Amino acid sequence: LGSSWLFLEVIAGPAIGLQHAVNSTSSSKLPVKLGRVSPSDLALKDSEVSGKHAQITWNSTKFKWELVDMGSLNGTLVNSHSISHPDLGSRKWGNPVELASDDIITLGTTTKVYVRISSQNE
C-alpha cells in the first residue's frame, strides 16, 4: 500500500457504522464489496440487498474511481442518481460509475454510504 486513499461510511442502514476504505496501490484487495450477507467488505444486512448490491474498483491509468451494481434489484444510486441500476428487469451488473469526494451511494431503501477520497504523502 501507499499511493492514494478512499474512505466510505454507512450513513443509514441495518448496520450504521460500517466504513470502507483502500489505497490506489491495492490490486486484488482494492475492489470493495458492499452487500447484505456474504464475503462482501461492508455488512449492509438489509433485505433490500439480497446478498450484494454494489462495489468499488478504480484505475490508476486514468486515475478514476468507479463502482458497479451487482444484480441491482433495489438499485444503487450515486449522489442521489441511479447511475448503475437504470434497468430493473435487466438486473444487469452495470458499468462502473465514477465516484467522487463528498458523493453518496444508496443501494436499497435507505442504506446510504458516504463517499470520500483523500490522498496521502508518504
Side-chain angles (χ1 to χ4, degrees):
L1 323 98
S3 171
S4 221
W5 256 115
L6 149 66
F7 319 84
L8 262 50
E9 193 243 38
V10 184
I11 210 185
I16 304 196
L18 331 141
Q19 266 182 280
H20 110 222
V22 52
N23 287 292
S24 55
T25 161
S26 254
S27 199
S28 222
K29 54 224 137 184
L30 188 167
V32 179
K33 268 211 249 301
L34 317 101
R36 179 222 157 67
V37 66
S38 13
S40 258
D41 196 39
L42 286 190
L44 302 303
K45 56 187 224 88
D46 206 1
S47 84
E48 38 95 337
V49 49
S50 69
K52 311 117 120 196
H53 236 74
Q55 23 174 112
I56 310 196
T57 151
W58 70 80
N59 240 287
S60 180
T61 322
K62 221 272 184 121
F63 43 90
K64 124 283 276 262
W65 319 50
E66 315 186 300
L67 60 63
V68 85
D69 270 25
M70 95 84 48
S72 17
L73 11 52
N74 248 261
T76 320
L77 21 163
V78 177
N79 67 73
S80 205
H81 237 341
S82 56
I83 41 43
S84 192
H85 63 113
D87 209 335
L88 288 306
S90 243
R91 307 244 216 243
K92 262 253 186 296
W93 180 276
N95 257 32
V97 173
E98 232 248 80
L99 57 276
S101 48
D102 298 70
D103 259 79
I104 33 116
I105 359 141
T106 332
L107 22 291
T109 184
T110 207
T111 309
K112 217 206 254 197
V113 237
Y114 208 49
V115 209
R116 232 286 266 264
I117 319 161
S118 216
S119 66
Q120 187 124 259
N121 273 46
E122 255 272 46

PDB file of all heavy atoms in Angstrom, residues 8 10 20 32-36 40-44 49 51-56 67-68 70 76 105 107 113:
ATOM      1  N   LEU A   8     -15.212   5.320   2.939  1.00  0.00           N
ATOM      2  CA  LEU A   8     -16.664   5.291   2.884  1.00  0.00           C
ATOM      3  C   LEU A   8     -17.277   4.981   4.233  1.00  0.00           C
ATOM      4  O   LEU A   8     -16.655   4.327   5.064  1.00  0.00           O
ATOM      5  CB  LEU A   8     -17.104   4.253   1.868  1.00  0.00           C
ATOM      6  CG  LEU A   8     -17.449   4.840   0.518  1.00  0.00           C
ATOM      7  CD1 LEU A   8     -16.343   5.754   0.044  1.00  0.00           C
ATOM      8  CD2 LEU A   8     -17.672   3.754  -0.489  1.00  0.00           C
ATOM      9  N   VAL A  10     -21.190   3.978   6.097  1.00  0.00           N
ATOM     10  CA  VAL A  10     -22.628   3.714   6.055  1.00  0.00           C
ATOM     11  C   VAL A  10     -23.369   4.732   6.923  1.00  0.00           C
ATOM     12  O   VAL A  10     -23.101   4.853   8.118  1.00  0.00           O
ATOM     13  CB  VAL A  10     -22.948   2.284   6.524  1.00  0.00           C
ATOM     14  CG1 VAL A  10     -24.429   1.981   6.377  1.00  0.00           C
ATOM     15  CG2 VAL A  10     -22.122   1.282   5.735  1.00  0.00           C
ATOM     16  N   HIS A  20     -15.682   1.755   4.660  1.00  0.00           N
ATOM     17  CA  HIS A  20     -14.816   1.027   3.747  1.00  0.00           C
ATOM     18  C   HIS A  20     -13.844   1.972   3.065  1.00  0.00           C
ATOM     19  O   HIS A  20     -14.230   3.010   2.529  1.00  0.00           O
ATOM     20  CB  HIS A  20     -15.658   0.215   2.747  1.00  0.00           C
ATOM     21  CG  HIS A  20     -15.643   0.698   1.323  1.00  0.00           C
ATOM     22  ND1 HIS A  20     -16.781   0.755   0.546  1.00  0.00           N
ATOM     23  CD2 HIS A  20     -14.626   1.087   0.518  1.00  0.00           C
ATOM     24  CE1 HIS A  20     -16.463   1.150  -0.672  1.00  0.00           C
ATOM     25  NE2 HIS A  20     -15.162   1.361  -0.716  1.00  0.00           N
ATOM     26  N   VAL A  32     -13.759  -3.155  -3.445  1.00  0.00           N
ATOM     27  CA  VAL A  32     -14.618  -3.286  -2.274  1.00  0.00           C
ATOM     28  C   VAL A  32     -15.902  -4.022  -2.642  1.00  0.00           C
ATOM     29  O   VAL A  32     -16.206  -4.176  -3.821  1.00  0.00           O
ATOM     30  CB  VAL A  32     -14.966  -1.912  -1.661  1.00  0.00           C
ATOM     31  CG1 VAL A  32     -15.888  -2.081  -0.469  1.00  0.00           C
ATOM     32  CG2 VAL A  32     -13.702  -1.169  -1.253  1.00  0.00           C
ATOM     33  N   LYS A  33     -16.634  -4.501  -1.638  1.00  0.00           N
ATOM     34  CA  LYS A  33     -17.864  -5.247  -1.879  1.00  0.00           C
ATOM     35  C   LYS A  33     -18.979  -4.888  -0.895  1.00  0.00           C
ATOM     36  O   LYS A  33     -19.055  -5.474   0.185  1.00  0.00           O
ATOM     37  CB  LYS A  33     -17.572  -6.739  -1.752  1.00  0.00           C
ATOM     38  CG  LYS A  33     -17.200  -7.397  -3.072  1.00  0.00           C
ATOM     39  CD  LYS A  33     -17.639  -8.853  -3.111  1.00  0.00           C
ATOM     40  CE  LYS A  33     -16.447  -9.795  -3.079  1.00  0.00           C
ATOM     41  NZ  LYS A  33     -15.521  -9.555  -4.218  1.00  0.00           N
ATOM     42  N   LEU A  34     -19.869  -3.966  -1.261  1.00  0.00           N
ATOM     43  CA  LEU A  34     -20.977  -3.620  -0.372  1.00  0.00           C
ATOM     44  C   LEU A  34     -22.111  -4.628  -0.574  1.00  0.00           C
ATOM     45  O   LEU A  34     -22.549  -4.854  -1.704  1.00  0.00           O
ATOM     46  CB  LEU A  34     -21.477  -2.192  -0.621  1.00  0.00           C
ATOM     47  CG  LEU A  34     -20.386  -1.131  -0.820  1.00  0.00           C
ATOM     48  CD1 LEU A  34     -20.206  -0.812  -2.294  1.00  0.00           C
ATOM     49  CD2 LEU A  34     -20.728   0.136  -0.051  1.00  0.00           C
ATOM     50  N   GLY A  35     -22.586  -5.234   0.520  1.00  0.00           N
ATOM     51  CA  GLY A  35     -23.653  -6.210   0.418  1.00  0.00           C
ATOM     52  C   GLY A  35     -24.238  -6.595   1.766  1.00  0.00           C
ATOM     53  O   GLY A  35     -23.734  -6.195   2.817  1.00  0.00           O
ATOM     54  N   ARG A  36     -25.326  -7.359   1.724  1.00  0.00           N
ATOM     55  CA  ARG A  36     -26.033  -7.799   2.933  1.00  0.00           C
ATOM     56  C   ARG A  36     -25.252  -8.849   3.720  1.00  0.00           C
ATOM     57  O   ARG A  36     -24.670  -8.548   4.761  1.00  0.00           O
ATOM     58  CB  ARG A  36     -27.411  -8.356   2.553  1.00  0.00           C
ATOM     59  CG  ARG A  36     -28.235  -8.870   3.725  1.00  0.00           C
ATOM     60  CD  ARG A  36     -28.947 -10.172   3.399  1.00  0.00           C
ATOM     61  NE  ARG A  36     -29.268 -10.927   4.610  1.00  0.00           N
ATOM     62  CZ  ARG A  36     -30.142 -10.520   5.530  1.00  0.00           C
ATOM     63  NH1 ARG A  36     -30.820  -9.392   5.359  1.00  0.00           N
ATOM     64  NH2 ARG A  36     -30.343 -11.249   6.619  1.00  0.00           N
ATOM     65  N   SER A  40     -18.616  -9.986   1.189  1.00  0.00           N
ATOM     66  CA  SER A  40     -18.580  -8.545   0.943  1.00  0.00           C
ATOM     67  C   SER A  40     -17.765  -7.817   2.005  1.00  0.00           C
ATOM     68  O   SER A  40     -17.546  -8.334   3.099  1.00  0.00           O
ATOM     69  CB  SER A  40     -20.002  -7.979   0.895  1.00  0.00           C
ATOM     70  OG  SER A  40     -20.416  -7.755  -0.441  1.00  0.00           O
ATOM     71  N   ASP A  41     -17.299  -6.619   1.665  1.00  0.00           N
ATOM     72  CA  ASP A  41     -16.489  -5.831   2.581  1.00  0.00           C
ATOM     73  C   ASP A  41     -17.339  -5.031   3.565  1.00  0.00           C
ATOM     74  O   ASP A  41     -16.923  -4.808   4.702  1.00  0.00           O
ATOM     75  CB  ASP A  41     -15.570  -4.888   1.801  1.00  0.00           C
ATOM     76  CG  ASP A  41     -14.447  -4.337   2.655  1.00  0.00           C
ATOM     77  OD1 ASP A  41     -13.903  -5.096   3.486  1.00  0.00           O
ATOM     78  OD2 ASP A  41     -14.109  -3.144   2.494  1.00  0.00           O
ATOM     79  N   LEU A  42     -18.544  -4.624   3.157  1.00  0.00           N
ATOM     80  CA  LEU A  42     -19.439  -3.887   4.046  1.00  0.00           C
ATOM     81  C   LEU A  42     -20.673  -4.740   4.345  1.00  0.00           C
ATOM     82  O   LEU A  42     -21.328  -5.243   3.432  1.00  0.00           O
ATOM     83  CB  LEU A  42     -19.857  -2.549   3.429  1.00  0.00           C
ATOM     84  CG  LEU A  42     -18.786  -1.454   3.413  1.00  0.00           C
ATOM     85  CD1 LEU A  42     -19.399  -0.123   3.009  1.00  0.00           C
ATOM     86  CD2 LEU A  42     -18.131  -1.320   4.772  1.00  0.00           C
ATOM     87  N   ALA A  43     -20.979  -4.901   5.624  1.00  0.00           N
ATOM     88  CA  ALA A  43     -22.130  -5.697   6.050  1.00  0.00           C
ATOM     89  C   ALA A  43     -23.397  -4.849   6.129  1.00  0.00           C
ATOM     90  O   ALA A  43     -23.789  -4.407   7.207  1.00  0.00           O
ATOM     91  CB  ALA A  43     -21.848  -6.354   7.392  1.00  0.00           C
ATOM     92  N   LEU A  44     -24.071  -4.690   4.996  1.00  0.00           N
ATOM     93  CA  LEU A  44     -25.333  -3.960   4.951  1.00  0.00           C
ATOM     94  C   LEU A  44     -26.453  -4.979   4.918  1.00  0.00           C
ATOM     95  O   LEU A  44     -27.143  -5.125   3.910  1.00  0.00           O
ATOM     96  CB  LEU A  44     -25.409  -3.060   3.716  1.00  0.00           C
ATOM     97  CG  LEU A  44     -24.296  -2.023   3.596  1.00  0.00           C
ATOM     98  CD1 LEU A  44     -24.263  -1.128   4.825  1.00  0.00           C
ATOM     99  CD2 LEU A  44     -22.956  -2.708   3.394  1.00  0.00           C
ATOM    100  N   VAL A  49     -30.787  -5.573  -0.149  1.00  0.00           N
ATOM    101  CA  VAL A  49     -29.663  -6.189  -0.843  1.00  0.00           C
ATOM    102  C   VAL A  49     -29.626  -7.686  -0.546  1.00  0.00           C
ATOM    103  O   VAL A  49     -29.106  -8.109   0.483  1.00  0.00           O
ATOM    104  CB  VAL A  49     -28.320  -5.527  -0.453  1.00  0.00           C
ATOM    105  CG1 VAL A  49     -28.185  -5.400   1.052  1.00  0.00           C
ATOM    106  CG2 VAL A  49     -27.145  -6.297  -1.037  1.00  0.00           C
ATOM    107  N   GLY A  51     -27.840 -10.108  -1.407  1.00  0.00           N
ATOM    108  CA  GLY A  51     -26.518 -10.533  -0.992  1.00  0.00           C
ATOM    109  C   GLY A  51     -25.505  -9.430  -1.202  1.00  0.00           C
ATOM    110  O   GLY A  51     -24.801  -9.030  -0.276  1.00  0.00           O
ATOM    111  N   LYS A  52     -25.454  -8.926  -2.429  1.00  0.00           N
ATOM    112  CA  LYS A  52     -24.549  -7.845  -2.787  1.00  0.00           C
ATOM    113  C   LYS A  52     -25.240  -6.884  -3.742  1.00  0.00           C
ATOM    114  O   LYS A  52     -25.793  -7.290  -4.763  1.00  0.00           O
ATOM    115  CB  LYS A  52     -23.269  -8.386  -3.427  1.00  0.00           C
ATOM    116  CG  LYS A  52     -22.621  -9.524  -2.653  1.00  0.00           C
ATOM    117  CD  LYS A  52     -22.604 -10.814  -3.463  1.00  0.00           C
ATOM    118  CE  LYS A  52     -21.185 -11.317  -3.682  1.00  0.00           C
ATOM    119  NZ  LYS A  52     -21.114 -12.327  -4.777  1.00  0.00           N
ATOM    120  N   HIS A  53     -25.192  -5.607  -3.402  1.00  0.00           N
ATOM    121  CA  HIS A  53     -25.797  -4.574  -4.227  1.00  0.00           C
ATOM    122  C   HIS A  53     -24.777  -3.960  -5.176  1.00  0.00           C
ATOM    123  O   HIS A  53     -24.983  -3.924  -6.390  1.00  0.00           O
ATOM    124  CB  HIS A  53     -26.387  -3.476  -3.349  1.00  0.00           C
ATOM    125  CG  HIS A  53     -27.835  -3.222  -3.603  1.00  0.00           C
ATOM    126  ND1 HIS A  53     -28.819  -4.077  -3.178  1.00  0.00           N
ATOM    127  CD2 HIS A  53     -28.467  -2.187  -4.204  1.00  0.00           C
ATOM    128  CE1 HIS A  53     -29.997  -3.583  -3.497  1.00  0.00           C
ATOM    129  NE2 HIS A  53     -29.815  -2.435  -4.121  1.00  0.00           N
ATOM    130  N   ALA A  54     -23.698  -3.435  -4.607  1.00  0.00           N
ATOM    131  CA  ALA A  54     -22.666  -2.773  -5.398  1.00  0.00           C
ATOM    132  C   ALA A  54     -21.291  -2.886  -4.768  1.00  0.00           C
ATOM    133  O   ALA A  54     -21.127  -3.447  -3.684  1.00  0.00           O
ATOM    134  CB  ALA A  54     -23.029  -1.305  -5.579  1.00  0.00           C
ATOM    135  N   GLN A  55     -20.303  -2.348  -5.478  1.00  0.00           N
ATOM    136  CA  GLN A  55     -18.916  -2.369  -5.033  1.00  0.00           C
ATOM    137  C   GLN A  55     -18.130  -1.262  -5.718  1.00  0.00           C
ATOM    138  O   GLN A  55     -18.665  -0.525  -6.541  1.00  0.00           O
ATOM    139  CB  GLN A  55     -18.278  -3.729  -5.325  1.00  0.00           C
ATOM    140  CG  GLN A  55     -18.953  -4.508  -6.441  1.00  0.00           C
ATOM    141  CD  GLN A  55     -18.205  -5.775  -6.802  1.00  0.00           C
ATOM    142  OE1 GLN A  55     -18.687  -6.884  -6.570  1.00  0.00           O
ATOM    143  NE2 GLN A  55     -17.015  -5.617  -7.371  1.00  0.00           N
ATOM    144  N   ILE A  56     -16.847  -1.158  -5.373  1.00  0.00           N
ATOM    145  CA  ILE A  56     -15.983  -0.142  -5.960  1.00  0.00           C
ATOM    146  C   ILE A  56     -14.650  -0.726  -6.410  1.00  0.00           C
ATOM    147  O   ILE A  56     -14.095  -1.619  -5.774  1.00  0.00           O
ATOM    148  CB  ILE A  56     -15.714   1.012  -4.975  1.00  0.00           C
ATOM    149  CG1 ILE A  56     -17.032   1.516  -4.375  1.00  0.00           C
ATOM    150  CG2 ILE A  56     -14.967   2.138  -5.683  1.00  0.00           C
ATOM    151  CD1 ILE A  56     -16.930   2.872  -3.710  1.00  0.00           C
ATOM    152  N   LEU A  67     -17.727   2.560  -9.326  1.00  0.00           N
ATOM    153  CA  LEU A  67     -18.451   1.488  -8.659  1.00  0.00           C
ATOM    154  C   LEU A  67     -19.408   0.793  -9.624  1.00  0.00           C
ATOM    155  O   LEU A  67     -19.859   1.391 -10.595  1.00  0.00           O
ATOM    156  CB  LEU A  67     -19.200   2.024  -7.440  1.00  0.00           C
ATOM    157  CG  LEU A  67     -20.249   3.098  -7.691  1.00  0.00           C
ATOM    158  CD1 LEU A  67     -21.381   2.564  -8.557  1.00  0.00           C
ATOM    159  CD2 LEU A  67     -20.784   3.581  -6.357  1.00  0.00           C
ATOM    160  N   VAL A  68     -19.712  -0.473  -9.354  1.00  0.00           N
ATOM    161  CA  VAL A  68     -20.608  -1.246 -10.212  1.00  0.00           C
ATOM    162  C   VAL A  68     -21.801  -1.786  -9.429  1.00  0.00           C
ATOM    163  O   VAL A  68     -21.772  -1.840  -8.201  1.00  0.00           O
ATOM    164  CB  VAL A  68     -19.861  -2.415 -10.891  1.00  0.00           C
ATOM    165  CG1 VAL A  68     -19.807  -3.643  -9.983  1.00  0.00           C
ATOM    166  CG2 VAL A  68     -20.518  -2.752 -12.215  1.00  0.00           C
ATOM    167  N   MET A  70     -23.876  -5.028  -8.829  1.00  0.00           N
ATOM    168  CA  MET A  70     -24.040  -6.465  -8.976  1.00  0.00           C
ATOM    169  C   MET A  70     -25.502  -6.848  -8.713  1.00  0.00           C
ATOM    170  O   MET A  70     -25.967  -6.815  -7.574  1.00  0.00           O
ATOM    171  CB  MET A  70     -23.068  -7.200  -8.036  1.00  0.00           C
ATOM    172  CG  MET A  70     -23.646  -7.609  -6.689  1.00  0.00           C
ATOM    173  SD  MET A  70     -24.546  -9.172  -6.771  1.00  0.00           S
ATOM    174  CE  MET A  70     -23.371 -10.186  -7.662  1.00  0.00           C
ATOM    175  N   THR A  76     -28.615   0.851  -7.084  1.00  0.00           N
ATOM    176  CA  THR A  76     -27.589   1.639  -6.400  1.00  0.00           C
ATOM    177  C   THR A  76     -27.520   3.050  -6.981  1.00  0.00           C
ATOM    178  O   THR A  76     -27.035   3.236  -8.096  1.00  0.00           O
ATOM    179  CB  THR A  76     -26.225   0.974  -6.566  1.00  0.00           C
ATOM    180  OG1 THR A  76     -26.332  -0.435  -6.461  1.00  0.00           O
ATOM    181  CG2 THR A  76     -25.208   1.438  -5.545  1.00  0.00           C
ATOM    182  N   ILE A 105     -23.736   7.016  -1.916  1.00  0.00           N
ATOM    183  CA  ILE A 105     -24.364   5.882  -2.581  1.00  0.00           C
ATOM    184  C   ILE A 105     -25.532   5.356  -1.768  1.00  0.00           C
ATOM    185  O   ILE A 105     -25.518   5.398  -0.543  1.00  0.00           O
ATOM    186  CB  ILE A 105     -23.403   4.698  -2.853  1.00  0.00           C
ATOM    187  CG1 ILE A 105     -21.973   4.983  -2.383  1.00  0.00           C
ATOM    188  CG2 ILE A 105     -23.416   4.341  -4.327  1.00  0.00           C
ATOM    189  CD1 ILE A 105     -21.318   3.776  -1.750  1.00  0.00           C
ATOM    190  N   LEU A 107     -27.818   1.797  -1.932  1.00  0.00           N
ATOM    191  CA  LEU A 107     -28.059   0.513  -2.574  1.00  0.00           C
ATOM    192  C   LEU A 107     -29.280  -0.201  -1.992  1.00  0.00           C
ATOM    193  O   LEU A 107     -29.223  -1.401  -1.727  1.00  0.00           O
ATOM    194  CB  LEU A 107     -26.812  -0.385  -2.476  1.00  0.00           C
ATOM    195  CG  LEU A 107     -25.809  -0.058  -1.363  1.00  0.00           C
ATOM    196  CD1 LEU A 107     -25.082   1.255  -1.633  1.00  0.00           C
ATOM    197  CD2 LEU A 107     -26.501  -0.039  -0.006  1.00  0.00           C
ATOM    198  N   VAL A 113     -24.247   5.103   1.847  1.00  0.00           N
ATOM    199  CA  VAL A 113     -22.856   5.178   2.289  1.00  0.00           C
ATOM    200  C   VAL A 113     -22.172   6.438   1.758  1.00  0.00           C
ATOM    201  O   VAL A 113     -22.290   6.757   0.576  1.00  0.00           O
ATOM    202  CB  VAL A 113     -22.032   3.954   1.804  1.00  0.00           C
ATOM    203  CG1 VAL A 113     -21.393   3.226   2.974  1.00  0.00           C
ATOM    204  CG2 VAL A 113     -22.888   2.998   0.989  1.00  0.00           C
TER     205      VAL A 113
END
